[PDB]
Design a protein around this ligand. Structure first.
Ligand SMILES: Nc1ncnc2c1ncn2[C@@H]1O[C@H](COP(=O)(O)OP(=O)(O)O)[C@@H](O)[C@H]1O
Ligand SMILES: [Mg+2]
Ligand SMILES: [Zn+2]
Lengths: 154, 97, 614
RNA sequence: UUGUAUUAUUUAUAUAAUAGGUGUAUUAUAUUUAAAUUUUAAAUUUGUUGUUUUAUAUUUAGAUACAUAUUUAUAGAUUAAUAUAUUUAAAUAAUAUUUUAAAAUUUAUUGAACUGUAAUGUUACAGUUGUAUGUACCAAAUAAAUAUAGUAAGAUUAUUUUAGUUGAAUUAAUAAAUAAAUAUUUAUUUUUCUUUGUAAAUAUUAUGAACAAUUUAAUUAACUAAAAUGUUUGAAUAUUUAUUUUUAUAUUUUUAGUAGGUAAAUGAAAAGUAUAAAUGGAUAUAACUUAAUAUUUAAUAUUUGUUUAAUGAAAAGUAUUUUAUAUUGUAUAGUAUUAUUAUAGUGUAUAGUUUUUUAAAAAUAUAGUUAAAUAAAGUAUGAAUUAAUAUCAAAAUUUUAAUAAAAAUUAAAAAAUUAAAAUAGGGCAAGUCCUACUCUCCUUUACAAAGAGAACAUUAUAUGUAAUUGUAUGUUUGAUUGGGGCAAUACUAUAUUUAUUUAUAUAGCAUAAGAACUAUAUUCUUUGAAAUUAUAAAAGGAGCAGGUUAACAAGCAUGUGUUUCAUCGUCUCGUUGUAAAGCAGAUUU
């Protein structure tokens, strides 16, 4: 046998196996090959964070993410705080912006993977598609989709 | 380490580059290269002067002198040794040629 | 026992600026990715990619239009589309193309247009020993081909082009040519051009155009930097002020762009435009097939070559008597035939040519054409059933050995290498080109830019570098003509053949490849870090999507599947496993304590409950 | 010692009344007017961290590149070589070069009381090694040594400073202006309204990106104060179309006073550098490797002496037998102890041959269904791992670069004692799976190379060769030691030929003596086919790496027949999705 030698780093150029993956033309349904994180992070997940400046009696939780644009600056349509504590911990829900609906939970952050960016995202804001929680979407791509008008076409 | 400097106001604290009015490293390289090229072109604006034997660098002067030694001791015009280390031909007419 | 904690056992490559920092430029290509282009001194500044999609759109004289009609060129290749505009704009240019997109025309036709403009509009006079254009090409065969391609244009446009090569009385012949016929274009080797300049047989007073056909070799040490010295002389002439202002422009046509070429052009001609298509640069054409044949031993290579020749139809002349063998060894046996005979075996003639040469439509962005007839100084005057072949060997000795072996076996072969005398070399090349010999055993002499009809290329010695291999491959896969390259390899070329095979299989450029297993295996620390980050991200995504884990395992799962843990000193990973010795020191202290306790217990068990006593 | 020999140099931790209350008294941290601020350091980490390692404390030990050259005094170059030498300097001086630490290897030596054999407890055999082991770390032990310490790592003693750039550079290899960055020393007054860090000598220089898109275009701060930053109306309410309500000022960084040389990193004593001799701070300074000491753990674990049925050697002890009772000698082992524990050879059987606390509980160890005993606290004695830590880290929420008691917000966290592993601490980039490469191992016909030996030459021991063998042993995928280009017959000129412009030759050249270092000009003294195989050869648990979102796919089967992959169909038939957002194996801590 004539055993050759070739490094994996050389082949990594052609890791993508589709147009969608190679050229990121559409949402990445858990098939993103190349990721661009910040130069100092170690846990490798995008962060959509919030800020708290007081107790709930002065600053409602949904107002924490007021520095970001989009629906998050509008008062959520449904509040699930006074009644009970839902198992998923979702405390606020916004009006459906198409087939997408935005939820906010009272937790440190749920590390999900959004099918548009394809990156793991750790945040309290989660956008779900047509009530199917198996397909979550982070707030950045949710806002971009709403801005572009692709609410029902992702 | 980073060169700390004595401050004269909080503006120096906010300042990052010690000389803001100075081009970054790449622009410095570009400007230096352009200046050197311009100086070289200005030097070469005139033709390539054919310097005499005595003006050649140290590593050509002695070789040329030894090559033409016999002609120097026996004086007769028309004697030229076609040495190899001499200055290369420019390719165009020049005022000094 | 030795160590029980590692971050990266292997060792990284010393290279920093690129994958092939240690290799010389003339042996490896240069990555064209934008990351490398950014630091590149040529590919970053100016790069022309917009295209004009018609010669009619291009401003050309009726003489040039008639010339290209004679040449059968009707649709511009993308390289021509990108390069004609800039060369007409009169900027120093670097044209790059994957071996058969039409670089010759791309850098000739605009230059001839400019020369006609100078001669007619500006009315610049023509002097005896002061040519307008100097064209440079390494090999004598390529010089002759360029002389033909320039003579057609000269006959069309009224210009005159000469070319010279080694002969019996080279000095006398060249001086006589210069004295007799004043010329507009001279196609010649840079060494001879420098000889003429130094002997002041030629002058740069009226020179306005410099063209280089193989910029890589010409600017590399492979050709003694003669082109570089000539270009420096041209720059000195341009700087010179007492003569009329000549904005001499340089065109570099190069099927490869390497470190040497890019650095020379970037550091000498800062305002040099570049015409490259990275998607198809440094790759073989799509109509080329590859077959890497292993051989158990070097002896089997001759049998494999005979098998390939027989398969493609170059049947040998069966030898059955001593006189037949003697005449086969002594005298050549040329083939004979005609177009009508082959057909039985001028639109109809063109269709027959397409069928014979395997020409297929060239599919470009939104337009298609058919490859024009080859441009060689020896037309295909003879046709035979067997397919044209070219066998590239390791050297002159191997070329001649294969030639004689095939002749003894019974094949009709020609030989081409530098050591042959001038007359024999001309006769051999003429035979192969005209078709009186369908097999040509040669060396890299014929691998450098020859436009000739060859059905397939055999590598009797698999090249160790991408440059020569890709040049030989491109010798056959022209504009759209089908091509096939076989390569007989051994254990020695295993690394290179595997790398090339993978690269061709997944259609990615041969930017950096070598025959050194360590070079092709050991990664470069930053590249390994990028790949590791991507792999960790993919593992994290898979873990998030598929697996659900409890709180007491979340920490460990994230640490071992979702965290980027940088190495301690990648330059010393081969020594300390990429882990700090201090942490390694603590780990080994604990493990050695445990091992000492276990060893004491084992000694007690084996000796009867007491180590010393038992 | 016929000078404490002389001269200089160095030097010990035995030892201890110290004070009866300045701050608070519902919880955040020195300067007392109450507040505010505050919550390690060093190295490592060049993706600069939340990674990594060290530090209980007191005192001490601890590491070497000469920051400077006064009259006698005088210093070139240069050719391959012969030779040539038109033609400007100088303070002739050498000795040194952190520190700790490599799996080391080398030399010499001992060990068979342990253990493993043979012999019948003892003898014999030992580190190119005896039979898993060879005296409580088997790459053994002892003695010597400062190996490429480098391409492991760590440490490295001198505050108040006084000047340039903060991501550039990168071309192996024939006549091409110039690598840059950082640091050290040093150099140049060139005109233009203003402004502008250029150059040389010298030292060092792997802190390392894969794609896509586009493009000749896109952690620093002198003090005081000042101070400018920051839930309806293309609907809603209503009925079978009408109603409704659609600027400023101010808050934290555009300034002075005073301190005060100058725009930040090469210690300071006029007191042994002694003439000085009773009131000289000569205060002149290593948080982690040394040594000693004092603490924490520690109100701790441990220890605890009220009950005895029974050996007459020797190696082994040497513990003061007052006189113990031929010559010579009687008692009191080993495991580091006054310890698990009879050392048993011989030999015998009624000598009671005499040291184990305590007034409960948990936990832990022992102890008439089916297939209840023993070990306490307390009095007394008194260890060990550990120890960056301010009197400390209730809790929740939110967030920052990997566990983050790190940050912020919110909130409200008492003290002691016992028990409990819930969290942190207590070594761990690991597990499985697929691919790839290599190692170990096997083999022989090739390579190197042993040693040994046969044979040969010369006349039972040797010298000189040594193609066999062994293959113990080390190798056996970097081929640019290639290819190209160069081809005597310059110069002026002539003739022939030409695969449609190549090819070939030749006519011309002797000789010449006064103006004295001398003028870019000349292609002439003579190479036209090296008929490959070097590179030793080859096969299939462990190590490293990749991938885990696999690999392959204008296919498959033997010209023909047939969609791909999958949704858990059915006994060929057939529904659905898909053309990848699809298909192997693994998915554990
Ligand atoms: N537009 C064109 N269309 C068809 N043939 C072309 C065209 N341009 C060049 N060629 C032909 O394609 C062949 C390769 O051209 P060439 O310039 O020699 O390749 P390269 O770019 O590698 O030098 C030649 O036969 C040439 O005549
Ligand atoms: Mg070409
Ligand atoms: Zn997203």
């Amino acid at each position: 046998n004539i055993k050759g030698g070739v490094g994996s780093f050389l082949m990594r150029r052609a890791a993508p196996k589709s147009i969608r993956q190679k050229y990121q033309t559409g949402p990445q349904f858990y098939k993103r090959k190349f990721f661009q994180f910040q130069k100092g992070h170690h846990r490798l997940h995008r962060r959509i964070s919030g800020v708290q400046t007081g107790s709930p009696t002065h600053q409602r939780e949904y107002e924490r993410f007021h520095h970001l644009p989009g629906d998050v600056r509008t008062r959520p349509q449904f509040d699930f705080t006074f009644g009970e504590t839902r198992a998923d911990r979702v405390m606020f829900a916004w009006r459906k912006r198409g087939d997408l609906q935005l939820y906010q939970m009272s937790g440190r952050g749920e590390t999900f993977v959004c099918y548009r960016c394809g990156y793991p995202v750790r945040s309290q804001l989660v956008a779900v598609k047509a009530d199917n929680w198996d397909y979550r979407m982070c707030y950045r791509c949710y806002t971009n989709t709403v801005h572009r008008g692709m609410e029902n076409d992702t | 380490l980073v060169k700390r400097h004595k401050i004269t106001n909080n503006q120096m604290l906010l300042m990052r580059r010690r000389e803001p009015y100075k081009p970054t490293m790449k622009d410095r390289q570009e400007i230096a290269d352009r200046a050197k090229l311009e100086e070289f072109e200005r030097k070469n604006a005139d033709g390539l002067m054919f310097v005499p034997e005595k003006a050649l660098p140290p590593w050509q002067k002695s070789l040329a002198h030894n090559a033409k030694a016999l002609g120097s001791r026996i004086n007769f015009r028309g004697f030229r040794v076609r040495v190899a280390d001499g200055q290369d031909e420019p390719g165009f007419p020049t005022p000094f040629r | 026992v030795p160590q029980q904690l590692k971050a990266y056992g292997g060792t990284f490559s010393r290279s920093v600026g690129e994958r092939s920092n240690h290799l010389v430029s003339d042996v490896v290509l240069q990555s064209l990715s934008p990351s490398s282009t950014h630091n590149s001194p040529l590919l970053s500044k100016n790069i022309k990619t917009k295209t004009v999609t018609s010669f009619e759109d291009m401003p050309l004289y009726p003489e040039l239009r008639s010339a290209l009609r004679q040449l059968r060129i009707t649709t511009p290749s993308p390289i021509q589309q990108s390069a004609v505009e800039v060369i007409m704009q009169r900027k120093d240019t670097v044209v790059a193309a994957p071996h058969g997109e039409g670089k010759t025309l791309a850098y000739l036709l605009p230059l001839y247009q400019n020369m006609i403009k100078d001669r007619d509009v500006y009315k610049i006079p023509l002097r005896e020993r002061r040519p307008r254009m100097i064209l440079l090409a390494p090999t004598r065969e390529l010089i002759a081909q360029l002389h033909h391609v320039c003579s057609v244009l000269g006959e069309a446009t009224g210009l005159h082009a000469i070319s010279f090569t080694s002969r019996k009385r080279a000095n006398h012949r060249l001086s006589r040519l210069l004295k007799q016929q004043l010329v507009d274009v001279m196609i010649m080797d840079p060494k001879i051009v420098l000889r003429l300049i130094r002997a002041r047989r030629v002058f740069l007073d009226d020179l306005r155009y410099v063209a280089v056909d193989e910029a890589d070799g010409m600017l590399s040490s492979q050709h003694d930097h003669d082109a570089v010295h000539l270009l420096m002389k041209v720059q000195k002439r341009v700087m010179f002020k007492h003569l009329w202002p000549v904005q001499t422009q340089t065109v570099f046509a190069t099927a490869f762009i390497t470190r040497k070429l890019e650095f020379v052009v970037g550091k000498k001609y800062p305002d040099a435009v570049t015409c490259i298509r990275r998607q198809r640069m440094h790759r073989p054409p799509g109509t080329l097939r590859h077959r890497f044949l292993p051989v158990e031993r070097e002896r089997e290579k001759m049998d494999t070559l005979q098998h390939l020749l027989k398969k493609h139809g170059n049947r040998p002349r069966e030898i059955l008597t001593d006189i037949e063998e003697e005449q086969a060894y002594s005298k050549p046996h040329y083939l004979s035939g005609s177009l009508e005979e082959l057909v039985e075996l001028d639109e109809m003639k063109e269709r027959v040519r397409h069928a014979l040469e395997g020409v297929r439509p060239v599919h470009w962005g939104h337009l298609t054409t058919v490859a024009a007839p080859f441009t060689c100084h020896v037309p295909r005057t003879v046709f035979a059933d067997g397919k044209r072949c070219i066998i590239f060997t390791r050297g002159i000795d191997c070329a001649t050995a294969v030639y004689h072996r095939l002749r003894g076996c019974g094949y009709t072969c020609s030989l081409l290498h530098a050591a042959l005398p001038a007359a024999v070399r001309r006769r051999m090349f003429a035979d192969f080109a005209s078709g009186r010999t369908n097999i040509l055993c040669s060396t890299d002499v014929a691998a450098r830019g020859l436009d000739l009809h060859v059905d397939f290329v055999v590598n009797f010695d698999m090249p160790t570098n991408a440059l020569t291999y890709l040049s030989r491959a491109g010798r056959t896969a022209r504009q759209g003509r089908l091509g096939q390259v076989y390569s007989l390899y051994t254990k020695r070329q295993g690394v290179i053949v595997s790398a090339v095979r993978a690269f061709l299989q997944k259609q990615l450029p041969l930017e950096g490849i070598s025959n050194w297993k360590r070079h092709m295996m050991e990664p470069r620390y930053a590249e390994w870090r990028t790949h590791k980050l991507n792999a960790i991200a993919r593992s994290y995504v898979s873990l998030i999507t598929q697996k659900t884990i409890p709180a007491h395992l979340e920490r460990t799962y994230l640490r071992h599947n979702a965290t980027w843990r940088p190495l301690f000193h990648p330059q010393t990973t081969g020594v300390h496993g990429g882990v700090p010795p201090r942490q390694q020191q603590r780990v080994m202290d604990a493990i050695t304590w445990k091992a000492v306790c276990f060893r004491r217990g084992l000694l007690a068990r084996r000796k009867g409950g007491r180590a010393k006593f038992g």
